[PDB]
Please model this.
Amino acid sequence: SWDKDVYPEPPRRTPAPSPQTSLPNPITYLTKAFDLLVDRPVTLVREFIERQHAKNKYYYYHREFRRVPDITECHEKDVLCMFEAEMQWKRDYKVDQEIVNIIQERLKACQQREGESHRQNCAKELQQFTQVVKAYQDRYHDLGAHYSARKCLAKQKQRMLAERKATKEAA
Amino acid sequence: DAPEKNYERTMAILQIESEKAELRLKELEVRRLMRAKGDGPWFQYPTIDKALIDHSPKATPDN
Model:
């Protein structure tokens, strides 16, 4: 399974089957035939394989990179520190990319799950998506194929100078 | 290879190559200053050896 808070799902509310007709639906017969002929043998084979897994259980880990000093507190043309800062920045760039991927998966799952009333019922997912795309665009857009932590720092400084001049000329 | 091994090997490569680059820039500046001023051990074009000069009393005194 997965973590149900980073990939949230609302509570499923299915209606009780209230048949009005007198004809039997074939779907219940096919559901019982799928439970007998398919679901039980697949379940038995999976329980067999899972017992074989439990006979020898071993573990893998999520790699933890401790934070190194970023590109701002690295001296100019000091490759030993700005290399570490650049590797830190590239890992953060790949992780921010996957954060955007998570929020896109949330938006698409919300749209399909809500179905026809998706425009009303998915406003919070749309809002989180708009915020994370605005953040990703302010952070990493237009850097180029030769992007670096220096390029991103220069883009951030230009954006901060624009924000400072717009603030100061409004006061 | 491990990411540790490649990472720290890369840092050793970067230290060696940055030191070589700084020394090449210094080599250019040293050659420029020594050709300009002539007071270093390089570009020492020869002048006449003063061990060849005769210092005896000559035939005429005014010399």
